[PDB]
Amino acid sequence: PKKPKEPVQVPKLVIKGGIEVLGVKTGVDSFTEVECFLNPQMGNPDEHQKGLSKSLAAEKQFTDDSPDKEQLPCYSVARIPLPNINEDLTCGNILMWEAVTVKTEVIGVTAMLNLHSGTQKTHENGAGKPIQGSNFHFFAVGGEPLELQGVLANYRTKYPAQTVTPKNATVDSQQMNTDHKAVLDKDNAYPVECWVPDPSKNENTRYFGTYTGGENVPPVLHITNTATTVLLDEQGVGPLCKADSLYVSAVDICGLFTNTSGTQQWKGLPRYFKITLRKRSVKNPYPISFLLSDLINRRTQRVDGQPMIGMSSQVEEVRVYEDTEELPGDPDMIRYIDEFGQ
Amino acid sequence: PKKPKEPVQVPKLVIKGGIEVLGVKTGVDSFTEVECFLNPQMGNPDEHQKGLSKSLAAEKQFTDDSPDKEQLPCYSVARIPLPNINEDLTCGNILMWEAVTVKTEVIGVTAMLNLHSGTQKTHENGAGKPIQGSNFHFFAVGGEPLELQGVLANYRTKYPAQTVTPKNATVDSQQMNTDHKAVLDKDNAYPVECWVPDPSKNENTRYFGTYTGGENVPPVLHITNTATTVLLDEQGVGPLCKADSLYVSAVDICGLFTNTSGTQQWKGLPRYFKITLRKRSVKNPYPISFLLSDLINRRTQRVDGQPMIGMSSQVEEVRVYEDTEELPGDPDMIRYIDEFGQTTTRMQ
Amino acid sequence: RRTQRVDGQPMIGMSSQVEEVRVYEDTEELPGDPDMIRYIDEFGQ
């Protein structure tokens, strides 16, 4: 007779349910898993065609290129409120929620096997024309909202009223236009065709996405619950829910639906997320002096004065000293070595 | 109950800001992260068609192939100055900025989702035909200017005014022509179709690029802030910035925008860089003597008079002596040195 | 002096295409706020 071993140890489930469950006070080594999802905002013309953009626009003239919101797919964003972790942070080492991992996938890929609804004909008596062409799938998870940077083709494009587009588009906007810095803070608001996550700055969020242009590139998608993604950074930390909030943003133009007519429209599917969070110990950034200042500015005035800042700062120079140094022979510390036209 | 862990110790940011900040007097073990970027140069025909080449030209007889600069996309380049670190450097310990890591990404890929603006129709009531076709993306990060090597098809091409092209096209320029070694020293000058990083030589810069040629190859690009690239060489030394300067170079022809009219023209996108620099200790491989030689001959007496060197040296003989020896019998004897030892032979 | 000068895109001054530079020296308990808010005018924004 052989003896059946003790079953291995596994993390103990404390409670399972909806977002409410978050509310249970857990230990410090607790950790949680959040399964949420996002619907796509492809345009949603009427209330029958969801996950469909409005019929798509064709050869508009630059000067008169004014599309309608309904034919402008936008980034889908959303925020998951998490429980404040530290009670009286009267003192120092507090806890923030850290996004560590994420599993994600596109809900309903199979759905594109209905070659029999509005479908245009493949040919003669063939099946219908499957969805295909240019597509973009992207997502991101982070401890603050998604920071963007606008770039577009044809800055002269007039943008639908309800959207949020780069302002003061110039020709430079057709390439890197540093002014077009924004933040994804409104669902179905920022047209994917005007924005891309600003690399210069998403320090507390991680994103990924790929574009595949093509008149008829075949969508390819994998569905599996065996794959995970890490959000840890080089120091081994993931996004930090600064404001005890978790932000999810995603976009999924699976491609183009070619109606019977020959008209085409963007299709999107929703995306899933499973986010693992842990209680991470940080160095309380927010406290006292900041509330101090927070306050004092309310007590004193804001003065609209001459520019001590930015491009037009009337501050010509600032020097900062710390210790002492042997008296320097050359007072204008040759700092850089001077290569312009030498 | 449960003790709030002590936080992890991570790198202390001393200061963030624009390039000037680079100038903070930091220690031997600090480092920085520089986030620059480059716009692309496809040609930029009018002042509204930034990111575009001039409407492209098709069939042209090899002989009569004179394209315009506005049609020729060029490599984009730039130099980031770095503060000299030896400023208060100790003895003969000399330090240089070493590029360790880079993160790059193409900016604005989502923009190719405006299938509605000058687009030729996909078909009937279709949308616009998206940008596609041959594409080339490349970049490089180095401690010196990017060294080129030119090569082309149709050496008999008449290259526009404002461009740097290979000098003295021969047939061998259509294949390996050694006379075409150059250097990317001017932005929007060297047109991509003529040059490529010369492999034989870029010994202090790393580069990468991929040509994906086709009448309608779909571009595929990813955008992610999770990926890093290492520039460390086989010895764990990335590009050293010889002259306290950092060289970034890149190219991104995403493909061809096809006009309603059916005219095609290249599209490009700016590219981002994030280079991580550290303080590397190196040795001055050269001698003071050789250094001063500069000031000296660069600034003292230069004289033009009868040749003491060359094949016309009016120096007829030089003998050298050190130590002594027993009086030799053949005074016309000859002592010489091959490539190592001392030969002693009679003249005849 | 020996190195060739390069006329290239602006990484310095008024059009510096250098968006940002960070410099680090030692270590520090993991700061709770990544874009190290230094000035107060820069709160939220």
Residue among B118, B124, B272 minimizing CB distance to A262: B124
Q: Find the angle CA(A166)-CA(B52)-CA(B125) to the nearest 5 degrees.
A: 75
Contact C32 A341 (CB under 8 A): no
Phi-psi sector, C32: left (phi>0), alpha (psi -120 to 50), beta: alpha
- What are chain B's partners, defined as 3 or more CB pairs within 8 angstroms? A, C
Q: Please report the resolution in angstroms.
A: 3.1
* C contacts of A282 (beta carbons < 8 Å): 29-32
In degrees rounded to 5, what are phi and psi of residue B218?
-80, 135
Burial class (CB in 10 A: 0-12, 13-18, 19+), B184: buried
| Superfamily of segment(s) A1-342 | Capsid protein VP1,Polyomavirus (2.60.175.10)
Alpha-carbon distance of A319 to A307, in angstroms, equals 19
Q: Which string of b and e fits A242-268 if b means at least 16 CB within 10 Å?
A: bbbebbbbbbbbbbbbbbeeebbbbbb
Question: Is B232 an interface residue toward A (CB < 8 Å)?
Answer: no
Burial class (CB in 10 A: 0-12, 13-18, 19+), B100: buried
Tell me the CA distances in angstroms from B220 to A29, A214, A288, B3, B200, one per residue in order. 42, 9, 49, 48, 30
Alpha-carbon distance of A182 to A249, in angstroms, equals 14
Helix (H, G, I), strand (E, B) or coil at A20: helix
Contact A297 C7 (CB under 8 A): no
Strands of B227-270 (E only): list them: 229-230, 245-258, 264-268
Q: What does the block give as tokens for A41?
A: 């905002």
Contact map slice: C 26-45 vs A, CB within 8 A: 28-35, 37, 40, 43
Alpha-carbon distance of B109 to A163, in angstroms, equals 19
Residue A222: CA count within 13 A, CB half-sphere: 5
Number of Cβ within a 10 Å radius of residue B49: 23
CB B244, CB B97: distance < 8 Å: yes
Q: Identity (one letter) of the amino acid at C15? A: S
Q: Which residues are CB-contacts of C37 (< 8 A; sequence separation ≥ 6)? A: A285, A290, C43
Instruction: Give the bridge partners for B138, in sequence order.
Output: B209, B251
Contact A196 B223 (CB under 8 A): yes
How many residues does the structure list for chain C? Answer: 45
Q: Which residue of C has its CA nearest to B32?
A: C23
Residue among B40, B84, B272 minimizing CB distance to A336: B84
Number of Cβ within a 10 Å radius of residue B177: 20
Q: Which residues are CB-contacts of B46 (< 8 A; sequence separation ≥ 6)? A: none
In a mutagenesis test of the C interface, which of A179, A202, A240 is the best target, namely the one with the most C β-carbons within 10 Å?
Answer: A240
Strands of B64-93 (E only): list them: 76-81
Q: Which residue of B has its CA nearest to C16?
A: B19
Q: Identity (one letter) of the amino acid at B348? A: Q
Q: Which residues are CB-contacts of B318 (< 8 A; sequence separation ≥ 6)? A: none
Contact C40 A96 (CB under 8 A): no
Return the C-alpha torsion angle A182, A183, A189, A191, nearest 10: 60
Alpha-carbon distance of A195 to A188, in angstroms, equals 13
The strand pair at B342-345 and B31-38 is best described as: unpaired
Residue in B137, B177, B186 with CA at minimum distance from that of residue B155: B177
* B contacts of A28 (beta carbons < 8 Å): 2-5
Which sign does the torsion angle of CA A320, A325, A330, A334 carry? negative
DSSP 8-state secondary structure symbol assigned to residue B186? B
Contact C14 A341 (CB under 8 A): no
> Radius of gyration over alpha carbons of chain C, in Å?
17
Contact B130 A28 (CB under 8 A): no
Alpha-carbon distance of A228 to A104, in angstroms, equals 8
In a mutagenesis test of the A interface, which of B114, B135, B269 is the best target, namely the one with the most A β-carbons within 10 Å?
Answer: B114
Alpha-carbon distance of C36 to C32, in angstroms, equals 9
Instruction: Give the bridge partners for A76, in sequence order.
Output: A250
Q: Which residues are CB-contacts of B161 (< 8 A; sequence separation ≥ 6)? A: B69
Alpha-carbon distance of B239 to B254, in angstroms, equals 28
Alpha-carbon distance of A291 to C11, in angstroms, equals 37
Helix (H, G, I), strand (E, B) or coil at B51: coil
Give the count of Cβ contacts less than 8 A between chain A and B. Answer: 246
Alpha-carbon distance of B333 to B347, in angstroms, equals 7
Residue among A171, A256, A283 minimizing CB distance to B48: A171
Alpha-carbon distance of A195 to A198, in angstroms, equals 8
User: Which option is the CATH number for B1-348: 1.10.4160.10, 1.10.1040.10, 2.60.175.10, 3.20.20.10?
Assistant: 2.60.175.10
CB A246, CB A36: distance < 8 Å: no
Residue in B172, B115, B126 with CA at minimum distance from that of residue B149: B172
Residue-by-residue DSSP string for A225-276: SS--EE---TTS---EESSSEEEEEEEEEEEEEEBSSS-EEEEE--EEEEEE
End-to-end C-alpha distance for chain C, whole angstroms = 45
Residue in B313, B267, B306, B278 with CA at minimum distance from that of residue B114: B267
CB B303, CB B72: distance < 8 Å: no
* Helix (H) or strand (E) run with residue A295 in it: helix A289-299
